[PDB]
Amino acid sequence: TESYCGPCPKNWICYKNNCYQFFDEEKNWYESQASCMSQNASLLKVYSKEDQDLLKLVKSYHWMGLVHWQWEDGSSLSPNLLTIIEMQKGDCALYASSFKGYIENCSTPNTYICMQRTV
Amino acid sequence: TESYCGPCPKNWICYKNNCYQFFDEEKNWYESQASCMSQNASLLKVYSKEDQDLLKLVKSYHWMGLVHIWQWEDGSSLSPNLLTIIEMQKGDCALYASSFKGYIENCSTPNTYICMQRT
Numbered sequence: 720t721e722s723y724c725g726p727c728p729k730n731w732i733c734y735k736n737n738c739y740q741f742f743d744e745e746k747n748w749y750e751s752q753a754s755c756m757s758q759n760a761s762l763l764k765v766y767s768k769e770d771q772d773l774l775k776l777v778k779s780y781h782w783m784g785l786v787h788w789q790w791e792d793g794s795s796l797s798p799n800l801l802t803i804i805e806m807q808k809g810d811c812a813l814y815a816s817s818f819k820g821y822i823e824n825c826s827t828p829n830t831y832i833c834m835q836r837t838v
Numbered sequence: 839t840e841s842y843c844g845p846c847p848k849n850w851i852c853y854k855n856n857c858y859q860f861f862d863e864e865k866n867w868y869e870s871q872a873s874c875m876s877q878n879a880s881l882l883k884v885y886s887k888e889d890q891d892l893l894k895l896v897k898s899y900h901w902m903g904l905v906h907i908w909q910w911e912d913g914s915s916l917s918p919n920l921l922t923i924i925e926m927q928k929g930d931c932a933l934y935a936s937s938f939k940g941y942i943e944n945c946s947t948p949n950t951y952i953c954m955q956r957t
C-alpha cells in the first residue's frame with residue numbers, strides 16, 4: 720500500500736525511489752548534462768517502464784542522457800523501452816511521452832530532466 | 839531519514855512529505871473530486887509557496903480543490919499571498935496553473951486534475 724520514497728535531496732521530487740528534477744531553462748545537451756552533474760546527478764536514464772511509469776504523462780520534450788545509442792554512464796539502451804523517432808538529424812535524444820526518444824541536434828536548446836538513484 | 843519522503847502510496851509522487859498524482863483523463867470538477875476520494879485523497883490544496891515550490895513546474899491547467907460557495911474541500915479558506923486568482927470565465931471551481939495562479943472556471947467543464955494526500 721503505502722511506502723516511503725528515497726533517499727533524495729529534499730528539493731527533489733521522489734517517485735519509486737528515484738529522484739527527479741525538472742529544468743525549464745532551455746540549454747543544449749552538454750550544458751544540460753553539466754547541470755545535472757553539478758548536482759550529483761545525471762540526465763534522465765529510462766530503464767524500466769514499470770518503475771518509471773509516470774514518464775507516460777510527460778508534457779513536452781526534454782533532454783535525456785541518451786547519445787549516439789547508449790546512456791551517459793556507458794550503459795546500453797535496453798531494447799523494449801523506447802521507440803526512437805527521427806525529428807532532426809543529430810546525435811542526442813529528447814524524451815517525450817509515451818516512452819519515445821526523438822533524435823535531436825545536440826546544440827538545440829531544450830528543457831531537461833535530471834535524475835538520481837541511491838539503488 | 840530526513841532524506842526519505844512519505845508516507846505515500848507506492849505509485850504516487852512524493853515531495854516534502856506531500857503525495858501527488860496527476861490524472862490526464864479529463865473530468866468535470868465533481869467527478870475529479872470523486873476520483874481523488876476513491877484513492878483516499880483530495881484534490882490539490884495549495885498552502886505554501888515554499889513547501890509546494892514544485893508547483894512552479896506544473897504544465898497545463900488542472901482542477902484543484904478550491905471552490906466558491908473561497909474554500910478548500912477541507913473547509914479551510916484560501917490563505918493570502920499564495921495564488922493569483924483570475925476570473926476570465928464566470929465559474930465556481932478553480933484550476934491550478936503555473937506559477938501559483940488559480941483560474942476560476944465552470945465546474946462542469948472537463949479538465950485534467952491533480953490529487954494530493956498527506957499523512
Ligand SMILES: CN1C(=O)[C@H](Cc2ccccc2)N(C)C(=O)[C@@H]2[C@H]1CCN2Cc1cc(Cl)cc(Cl)c1
Nearest residue numbers: 732734739771773774776777778860892895896897
Ligand atoms: C503535468 N506534469 C507536470 O507538470 C510535471 C512537473 C511536475 C511534476 C510533479 C509535480 C509538479 C510538477 N511534468 C513537467 C511532466 O512532464 C509530467 C506531468 C506529471 C508527471 N510529470 C512527469 C514525471 C515523470 C516521472 Cl517518472 C516522475 C516525475 Cl516526478 C514526473
